[PDB]
Symmetry: D2
Subunit: 121 residues, 4 copies
DNA sequence: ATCAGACTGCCGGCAGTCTATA
DNA sequence: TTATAGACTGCCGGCAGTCTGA
DNA sequence: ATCAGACTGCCGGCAGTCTATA
DNA sequence: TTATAGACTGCCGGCAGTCTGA
């Protein structure tokens, strides 16, 4: 409503600024992969309908660096698109469907937030 | 870039950001009743350089505002929303000599202009 | 053994220095009452046999002060002689046995260890 | 004063109980070396007159394990005998006198508190 | 369904009164 | 008995969260 | 100018070896 | 002489931030 005009002026916290930076890094990695962008948007678009793994190269430690701060990608993007407060990779368990989950220690890793489930420690 | 906007449309907001919207909604409802205040507030945020007049809302006896079950100080809130998200005390804010109704005054009404206040370490 | 010699050289943490000062304060108010130390020392000496109330004037505020640090008298001494880690009075249960417990609002308080029991806080 | 009789019945917190446990390990450990015990008592007894290094064998990590708690020896004993609030080895600098300070990385290390000085930062 | 005004709780600092001690 | 030093009760402040009634 | 792969620091737990003491 | 009790070194893990180099 009228509030929409005002919230344009709301400034963003440091995290959201970072989150935006983290997403840009993702699209840069995902553009080289063909079709991956649409599957993620479809994955994000609809919760119910399964989606194919969306993958990125997996580091030796598995930590991604974005804008000077390291993190684990599935943690980062699940926090971005599903649970903002998600505290650690311990809170995430992979799904049976996921071809390239985090534990697998394979070459690429699936960062689709809907391939994971949140659990209490 | 636009595709990033398409994806970031799907981003979730932290409890606070969800709250900031609720606080802004509460103010506009309270602020809509006075008719000349609404445009000036937008003009003050719209214009950084030119000063703009006090925008007022009633001061409770203790001075706390309640939005969605959590109380706050009205001036720190909207300063937190529109200027400094990192703001955490009213001790960090010093009113300006311009403000007819600052928080310290203990008057009937309070000025919610984020730009009538100044940020200081303390 | 020889360790006794070395531990004489050991330094004490700020709290243990505070504990000594608080105990010094207790006997000073306690010395005015005759024999109270003996019932207290016997109570501390033997856990099993119950012992008479040892009381101190109860402030309006209920807070005792020793050297700029306020506290609740029954908590302070239960912390000295029974539980060093006692965090707050909620953790303490008075006894049906005790004639004078902190919850009592008379103008005196019984600070007897072994007259209270430790319970899990809410 | 008269309080000394009752204050014996004061209970001791977890740290002090450990401190005694730490001191006991030292002497038992420090008894095989001859004369060290006297020098340490002399070291502690007299603050102004200097005393020779008091030594114990130095591990690969430099950490000493006592009663399930790992620590650095010169830190422990300075904390016991000199500054109880001493937080870390950073706060400690050796004296020009000390023959086997912590930095030396020698076969044995000097745990005499008075061979060290406390420093800001 | 939600907020304003009340309350109590908790926690400090402070000043006038209080206690040693020479 | 007297003067000067440090004590603490009591009072005050801020802070923050709960609850009934508007 | 920014990120991957390294390193060290810090801090715990763990297991095999050591030491009393019966 | 032997076995069983408790001890600790050394090693190991995860964690986190720095730095050089691609
Ligand atoms: Zn997947
Ligand atoms: Zn103003
Ligand atoms: Zn009692
Ligand atoms: Zn030395």
């Amino acid at each position: 409503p009228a509030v929409k005009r005002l919230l344009g002026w709301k400034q963003g916290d440091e995290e959201e600024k970072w989150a935006e930076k983290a997403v840009d890094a993702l699209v840069k990695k995902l553009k080289k992969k063909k079709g991956a962008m649409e599957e993620l948007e479809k994955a994000l678009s609809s919760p119910g309908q399964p989606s194919k793994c969306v993958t990125i190269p997996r580091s030796l430690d598995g930590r991604l660096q974005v804008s000077h701060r390291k993190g684990l990608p599935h943690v980062i993007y699940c926090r971005v698109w599903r649970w903002p407060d998600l505290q650690s990779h311990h809170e995430l368990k992979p799904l049976d469907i996921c071809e390239f989950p985090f534990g697998s220690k394979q070459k690429e890793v699936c960062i689709n937030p809907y391939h994971y489930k949140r659990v209490e420690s």
